[PDB]
Amino acid sequence: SGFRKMAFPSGKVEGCMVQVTCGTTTLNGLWLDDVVYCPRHVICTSEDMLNPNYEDLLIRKSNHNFLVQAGNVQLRVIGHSMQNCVLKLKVDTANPKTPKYKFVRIQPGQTFSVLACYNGSPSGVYQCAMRPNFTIKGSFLNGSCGSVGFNIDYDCVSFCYMHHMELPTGVHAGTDLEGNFYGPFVDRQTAQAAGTDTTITVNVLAWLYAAVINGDRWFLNRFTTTLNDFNLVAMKYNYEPLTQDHVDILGPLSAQTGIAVLDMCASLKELLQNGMNGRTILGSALLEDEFTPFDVVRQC
Amino acid sequence: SGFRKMAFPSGKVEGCMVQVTCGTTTLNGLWLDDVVYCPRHVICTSEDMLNPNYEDLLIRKSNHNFLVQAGNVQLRVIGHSMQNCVLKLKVDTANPKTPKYKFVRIQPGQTFSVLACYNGSPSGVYQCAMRPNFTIKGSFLNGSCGSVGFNIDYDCVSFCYMHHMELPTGVHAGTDLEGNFYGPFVDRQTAQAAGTDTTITVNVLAWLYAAVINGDRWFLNRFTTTLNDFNLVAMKYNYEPLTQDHVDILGPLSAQTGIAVLDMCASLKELLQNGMNGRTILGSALLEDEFTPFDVVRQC
Ligand SMILES: *[C@H](O)[C@H](Cc1ccc[nH]c1=O)NC(=O)[C@H](CC(C)C)NC(=O)c1cc2ccccc2[nH]1
Ligand SMILES: *[C@H](O)[C@H](Cc1ccc[nH]c1=O)NC(=O)[C@H](CC(C)C)NC(=O)c1cc2ccccc2[nH]1
């Protein structure tokens, strides 16, 4: 019983975290088969990061300027390529510990586990959600780049995120494992905006559902409302609009608890209009939107 | 940049999680060398759990009534012993993946990572704090028992917690790895109270310090106060008393930030007396006490 932000077990992923060094810059890479993936700004000096031409910078680099370390062992780089914002260093030895894996591009509102790494060594695990503005709210210091975000589905690690950047607001931006950024970000030391952060309404409603399943029911109201009317009030509060697909996703949760989605949307509406009056739901004095319906079900 | 509840990487611990079955009861065990550790109520039926005599129950059991599974492989139980509330099943094969490890008894206010397991298979990782009333606020369903709590210090896994029980309030109680409960709990299906839950004041102050380091400063006040006067107001709010050792622990954090402990205690005092006025610190509308000073430093 109880509900907590949980991350996937990190073991399969720890075995793929290497250290990549190019000159004075050192970052984490991800060693799957005979290929190492890291952020391409590893090939940058502090001067270059202001206005980098990555084709030109890399053309200057040769396989031997890239140091890949796995614990103590040194991998021999026999190839180098640039896919979008990601450098692919081909190496001699396939990773014996390559787990079964896939590269996925998650959509906004979905969550993933992050293994935060410094120097190719894991330091800690936490769960993040792709915000709607394509940022994440993590714990990344300098050296965390190349740290990866993943889901574990059965035996298969779905890699979805590699960390590249912190924004001026302190949020974090990164790419998929094909090197395409989430959001309108570029790997350059320039001022960049994520824009208006909005609340994943479907997740807040899964969370309210987790609360009811764990015994918190005070927020429940006898009123009900309409989808469009809920969305009318929601958009005022920069809440992402609910859809009938959203409703179908919350379906097995509205079933389990005997509370209809439109009944919950009315109870959420009162909480947005009337505040929380100093109470707490599931130990939070604010509304949580970093759990998906799937997250809640897997826990409950 | 940023502050998040982080758990240790779980890889060394995943490799020690086995499944223990005795009759119709199945639980998780922890396989270190030629010894498996699990909660002893594995030897109980649903009738026995009401008023169990564990000596008598186990005397009826023989090595062959205990099924230990590691993935598919079956370990052969060649020994059985009861240490406090923990059953030690001696086995034939030493665990090849035994990490370097130690058994520690944590003190209240300290935090640890939990790997939550079902059927000897890991499902997720989160960070917990030993509450002052010796309970924990986790996410444990039936079958989670024998799931373990740990810290990773250098190369060495310090096992500190094994889960046994949920209380009527929904909090969780368990033992150290020598089988001694944290708190006044017994492994019996009876109504049991943890008592008054109090707030780890030293942790809240480390958290306020993490907030300042990450840029949240609004709560900071020009006032200051005295230790004893702070403790006067604190005890009203069921906050654990601060001590000069506590102060020395928060020392490197009061140094880094240029704010004295007694200056922070005054700023905490205003927040207890004047509320938070609807603002947020580090994304929370409540005061967080599940980070120790060490946790904050390791992250920052
Ligand atoms: C990668 O290791 C590092 C991640 C990092 C750095 C500092 C704090 N937190 C972190 O997570 N990422 C960077 O250093 C990147 C470098 C590449 C070329 C994008 N740059 C920044 O993160 C950065 C640059 C910048 C300019 C102005 C405001 C903020 C800002 N952040
Ligand atoms: C161990 O797998 C299981 C853990 C569990 C069970 C249900 C919900 N959440 C959980 O974490 N622990 C138990 O089943 C134990 C059994 C032993 C003998 C202690 N019992 C309880 O957890 C329990 C018994 C009881 C009686 C009255 C109120 C509450 C209560 N909880």
Enumerate the residues of chain A whose CB falls inside 8 A of the CB of residue B298: 123
What CATH number is given to the structural domain containing B23?
A: 2.40.10.10
| Cβ contact B128:B137 at 8 Å | yes
Which of B197, B220, B239 terminates a domain? The answer is B197
Residues A294 and A203 in one domain: yes
Alpha helix stretches (DSSP H) within chain B: 11-14, 54-60, 201-213, 227-236, 244-249, 251-257, 261-274, 293-299
What CATH number is given to the structural domain containing B266?
A: 1.10.1840.10
The Cα A222–Cα A213 span in angstroms is: 18
SS (H, E, C) chain A: CCCCCCECCCHHHHCCEEEEEECCEEEEEEEECCEEEEEHHHHCCCCHHHCCCHHHHHHHCCHHHEEEEECCEEECEEEEEEECCEEEEEECCCCCCCCCEEECCCCCCCEEEEEEEECCEEEEEEEEECCCCCCECCCCCCCCCCCEEEEEECCEEEEEEEEEEECCCCCEEEECCCCCECCCCCCCCCCCCCCCCCECHHHHHHHHHHHHHCCCCCCCCCCCCCHHHHHHHHHHCCECCCCHHHHHHCHHHHHHHCCCHHHHHHHHHHHHHHCCCCCCECCECCCCCCCCHHHHHHHC
Residues B136 and B4 in one domain: yes
Domain count, chain A: 3
The Cα B221–Cα B265 span in angstroms is: 10
Distance of CA A159 to the CA centre of its chain: 10
Among candidates B72, B66, B79, which has minimal Cα distance to B29? Answer: B66
Among candidates B38, B49, B44, B120, which has minimal Cα distance to B87? Answer: B38
Data resolution in angstroms: 2.4
Q: Which residues, 6+ apart, have CB-to-CB distance to B126 below 8 Å?
A: A4, A5, A6, A7, B5, B7, B113, B114, B116, B138, B139
Residues A89 and A150 in one domain: no
Q: Which amino acid is at A108?
A: P
Which of B99, B126, B159 terminates a domain? The answer is B99
The Cα A115–Cα A11 span in angstroms is: 10
| Cβ contact B35:B90 at 8 Å | yes
Residues A148 and A169 in one domain: yes
Ligand 2 atom showing the smallest separation from residue B191 Cα: 27
Residues B90 and B106 in one domain: no
- How open is the CA angle B163-B169-B174, to the nearest 5 degrees? 15
Cross-chain residue pair B140–A1, CB shorter than 8 Å: yes
Distance of CA B243 to the CA centre of its chain: 23
- Number of alpha carbons in the 13 Å side-chain half-sphere of residue A219: 35
Q: Say what angle helices B261-274 and B201-213 make with each other, to 10 degrees.
A: 100
Q: Which amino acid is at A143?
A: G
- Token pair of A101 as six digits: 């894996």
Residues A298 and A271 in one domain: yes
| Cβ contact B155:B135 at 8 Å | no
Give the number of other Cβ atoms within 10 Å of residue A180's Cβ.
Answer: 12
What backbone torsions phi and psi does residue B40 show, to the nearest 5 degrees?
-75, -15
Q: Does the beta carbon of A191 sit less than 6 angstroms from any atom of ligand 1? A: yes
The Cα A58–Cα A198 span in angstroms is: 38
Give the number of other Cβ atoms within 10 Å of residue A56's Cβ.
Answer: 9
- CA B44 to ligand 2 centroid distance, Å: 12
Three-class secondary structure of residue B230 per DSSP: helix
| Cβ contact B34:B76 at 8 Å | no
Which of B176, B197, B218 terminates a domain? The answer is B197
Enumerate the residues of chain B whose CB falls inside 8 A of the CB of residue A299: 124, 139
Residues B212 and B300 in one domain: yes
| Cβ contact B172:B166 at 8 Å | yes
- Token pair of B55 as six digits: 């000596």
For residue B164, indicate whether it is catalytic. no
For residue A145, indicate whether it is catalytic. yes
Q: Which of B22, B38, B117, B145 is catalytic?
A: B145
What backbone torsions phi and psi does residue B270 show, to the nearest 5 degrees?
-60, -35
Residues B249 and B193 in one domain: no
Q: Containing domain of residue B42, as a range?
A: 15-99
Compare all CA atoms of chain B with the CA of A118 and give the residue at the minimum distance. Answer: B299
Q: Which of B41, B163, B164, B246 is catalytic?
A: B41
Enumerate the residues of chain B whose CB falls inside 8 A of the CB of residue A116: 6
Cα distance from N-terminal residue to C-terminal residue, chain A: 8
Q: Which amino acid is at B288?
A: E
Among candidates A148, A41, A27, A25, which has minimal Cα distance to A85? Answer: A41
Give the number of other Cβ atoms within 10 Å of residue A267's Cβ.
Answer: 21
Distance of CA A170 to the CA centre of its chain: 15
Residues A2 and A133 in one domain: yes
Q: Which residues, 6+ apart, have CB-to-CB distance to B175 below 8 Å?
A: B39, B84, B85, B86, B161, B162, B164, B181, B182
Residues B7 and B104 in one domain: yes
- How open is the CA angle B86-B88-B89, to the nearest 5 degrees? 140
- Token pair of A194 as six digits: 């994520």
Q: Which long-range contacts (CB under 8 A, 24 or more apart) does B185-193 make?
A: B185/B134, B187/B39, B187/B40, B187/B41, B187/B52, B187/B54, B187/B85, B188/B49, B188/B50, B188/B51, B188/B52, B189/B49, B189/B50, B190/B50, B192/B167, B192/B168, B193/B167
| Cβ contact A77:A68 at 8 Å | yes
- How open is the CA angle B126-A106-A197, to the nearest 5 degrees? 80
| Cβ contact B30:B17 at 8 Å | yes
Residues B91 and B139 in one domain: no
Among candidates B154, B150, B127, B121, which has minimal Cα distance to B15? Answer: B121
Residues B167 and B183 in one domain: yes
Task: List the beta bridge partners of residue A150.
Answer: A113, A159
Give whole-number Cα distances, B8 to A14, A258, B88, B148, in Å.
11, 38, 26, 13
Length of chain B: 300
